[PDB]
Amino acid sequence: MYALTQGRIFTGHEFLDDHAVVIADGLIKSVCPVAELPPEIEQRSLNGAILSPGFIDVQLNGCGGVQFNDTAEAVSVETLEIMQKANEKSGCTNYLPTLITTSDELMKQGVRVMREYLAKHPNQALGLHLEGPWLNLVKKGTHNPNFVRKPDAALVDFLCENADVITKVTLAPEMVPAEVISKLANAGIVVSAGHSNATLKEAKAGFRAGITFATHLYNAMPYITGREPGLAGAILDEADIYCGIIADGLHVDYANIRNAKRLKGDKLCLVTDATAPAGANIEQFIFAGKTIYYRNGLCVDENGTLSGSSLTMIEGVRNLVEHCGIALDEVLRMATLYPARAIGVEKRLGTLAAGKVANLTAFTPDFKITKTIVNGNEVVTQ
Amino acid sequence: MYALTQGRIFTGHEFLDDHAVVIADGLIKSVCPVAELPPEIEQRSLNGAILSPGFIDVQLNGCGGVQFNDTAEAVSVETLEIMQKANEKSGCTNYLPTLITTSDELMKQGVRVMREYLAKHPNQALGLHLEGPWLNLVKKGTHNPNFVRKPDAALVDFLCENADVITKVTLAPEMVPAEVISKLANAGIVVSAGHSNATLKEAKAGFRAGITFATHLYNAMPYITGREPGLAGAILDEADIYCGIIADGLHVDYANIRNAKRLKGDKLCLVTDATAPAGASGSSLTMIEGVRNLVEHCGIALDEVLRMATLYPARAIGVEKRLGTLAAGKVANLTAFTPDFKITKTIVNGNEVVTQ
Ligand SMILES: [Zn+2]
Ligand SMILES: [Zn+2]
């Protein structure tokens, strides 16, 4: 047992000064004023850094130089181990390894690997985020067009049967029967609308069937016209729909993010949707059979096509703060509480409270990580 | 003088249930509890209708079978008079006749005609709304590409010289020098961005040069995309920018209007952008219809909807000192309607011109 002290603490609901967070047995024992601590308890100074719950990234394809995609060799427990350690250096203690449209074979392999990972590393990579393959070719992005396909009943049932390791599935509502959505949803899986060219009507039909989330707002969605709001327009006007947004300033112009935050309120979650180069130092990487060069801090292919993100959660936090006029506290919620409630793990992860898992991170005013704690153990010290 | 009583009174800032409005000498003399009314003044019952400042439509090309466009015969004081009477029936007491991109000659005639109308009719058609010709062909909509053109010193100066009868000018910011925008604005003209394919950056440059309004949001503008906000995204993100929106459920999906109202706050104005058919594609919206649509389909409170049709447009074009609210000294232009949005009474300069 020990307690973090001497620094601003963000519980997820407010900032506390002259307070302490007592951690013991991998959980947060309590939050109290530094005054109510028995002098003999081990005290670890924050050195004036802001303490926050660990960041939760609900959409991440890869980082730390690797990717949980494409090959059978990549889709492995070690990739998840490498990805986890990379995120931690960025204050991200939890994430959803995201596997994009590929073969049923690789999909089934992902499930086994995730399950294998869960049996070794607790409260870290929470579960699978299957992005695809039931998408719309027109908004396929970088996905392999050969794997974009209609949903097979058997594959659908397979997913429901394995909902215990599948946190979320992104599909194009106008490309799937309502039943599939309702099926996956009733199985306990978060169904999100994305890589879709759905009209407003199709989007709303997608929500009524059970979709409760939207993947990277504005990206791989119809443009917004006066007469046809499209899926993005629809997500904006639907109060209860949660949605992620990539805040690197490249995928979404900051004005669009500010507009989205005003309309989404407490339903907008920060995501990185990052790839291999994030939290690493590589020149390029392969994906969907294409070479994505990491040229000038940008992931672009030979055509000049922006083909990926290298954002990290602290960076996203920093950008939302200084470029989008969102106060730090609300931004912190966008990286913890909100995504936690969006995937249903707020019972134990989105905030700093008694009984919650001891996953935290600390950073200085200039947004530099100084600490990352996982299951009570300090894994990052800078 | 007379007093309007027995009905809900919306001043522009609040509803009053047991009050009255006294009209005299074409002005609103006072708003007071019915029990404070001078016993001598004639009392006229609203019969339970809702009384409100007269609607102000800042973008109208035609109505009542006529149009203030195209021909030298149409751009006339008579057309303006016909449009006014037709507007009065749908609760609209003020409007900006809108002349779309055409020749310099027709523009000059429009200006002359507006001045002659003004010397004869006060507090009615307020001033000219010149939509074009400095537009972007990509977003010319129904505008004649042959007349869409760049601004030349001569035209610019003529408009500035006639700022007093020209209320607004719609232009594509990315198609004109910043100096042209500032020239118009400094002359007192409301410069509005419209029929533009402007990027967010070009839109912002326009605002800094003096643009303070945007014509029919979402229409004849770049479609919004994550990486390309365009003029529309910029307007939504710019708090000080006023803008009109067509609420017929056809030009703009109601969902976009809701997203728009939430981001624009008190800067969103209801407009019809109506044409000939309105009175008796294109728009045939009337202001009272737009009010009904906004309330029943956009989840906006009636009082806020009523402001979108009076106070806001009034402030957008700088006539709030005499119009837009039911308060002492303001011009007596009002309209009354039943809860189901049927006009029962319209008053202009204190005179009841509509009785139903
Ligand atoms: Zn995607
Ligand atoms: Zn127009």
Curated annotation (Swiss-Prot), chain A:
Changing H251N: 500-fold decrease in catalytic efficiency. GO terms for molecular function: identical protein binding; N-acetylglucosamine-6-phosphate deacetylase activity; zinc ion binding. It holds the Pfam family Amidohydro_1. Keywords: Carbohydrate metabolism, Hydrolase, Metal-binding, Zinc. Its EC number is 3.5.1.25. Pathway: Amino-sugar metabolism; N-acetylneuraminate degradation; D-fructose 6-phosphate from N-acetylneuraminate: step 4/5. Its cofactor is Zn(2+); Co(2+); Mn(2+); Cd(2+). Inhibited by high substrate concentration and by products glucosamine 6-phosphate and acetate. Completely inactivated by the treatment with 5,5'-dithio-bis(2-nitrobenzoate) or 2,2'-dithio-pyridine (2-DPDS). Inhibited by 1,10-phenanthroline and EDTA. Belongs to the metallo-dependent hydrolases superfamily. NagA family. This is N-acetylglucosamine-6-phosphate deacetylase. It comes from Escherichia coli (strain K12). The lineage of its organism: Bacteria, Pseudomonadati, Pseudomonadota, Gammaproteobacteria, Enterobacterales.
UniProtKB/Swiss-Prot annotation, chain B:
Changing H251N: 500-fold decrease in catalytic efficiency. GO terms for cellular component: protein-containing complex. It comes from the Bacteria. Disruption phenotype: Synthesizes high levels of glucosamine-6-phosphate deaminase and over half of the amount of glucosamine-6-phosphate synthase compared to wild-type. Inhibited by high substrate concentration and by products glucosamine 6-phosphate and acetate. Completely inactivated by the treatment with 5,5'-dithio-bis(2-nitrobenzoate) or 2,2'-dithio-pyridine (2-DPDS). Inhibited by 1,10-phenanthroline and EDTA. Substrate binds at T142, H143, N219, A220, R227, D248, G249, L250, H251, S281, G282. Involved in the first step in the biosynthesis of amino-sugar-nucleotides. Catalyzes the hydrolysis of the N-acetyl group of N-acetylglucosamine-6-phosphate (GlcNAc-6-P) to yield glucosamine 6-phosphate and acetate. In vitro, can also hydrolyze substrate analogs such as N-thioacetyl-D-glucosamine-6-phosphate, N-trifluoroacetyl-D-glucosamine-6-phosphate, N-acetyl-D-glucosamine-6-sulfate, N-acetyl-D-galactosamine-6-phosphate, and N-formyl-D-glucosamine-6-phosphate. It is an enzyme of class 3 (hydrolase). Zn(2+) binds at E131, H195, H216. It catalyses: N-acetyl-D-glucosamine 6-phosphate + H2O = D-glucosamine 6-phosphate + acetate. Its EC number is 3.5.1.25. Keywords: Carbohydrate metabolism, Hydrolase, Metal-binding, Zinc. Pathway: Amino-sugar metabolism; N-acetylneuraminate degradation; D-fructose 6-phosphate from N-acetylneuraminate: step 4/5. Changing D273 to N/A: Loss of catalytic activity. InterPro entries: Amidohydro-rel, GlcNAc_6-P_deAcase, Metal-dep_hydrolase_composite, Metal_Hydrolase. GO terms for biological process: N-acetylglucosamine catabolic process; N-acetylneuraminate catabolic process; protein homotetramerization. Belongs to the metallo-dependent hydrolases superfamily. NagA family. Homotetramer. This is N-acetylglucosamine-6-phosphate deacetylase.
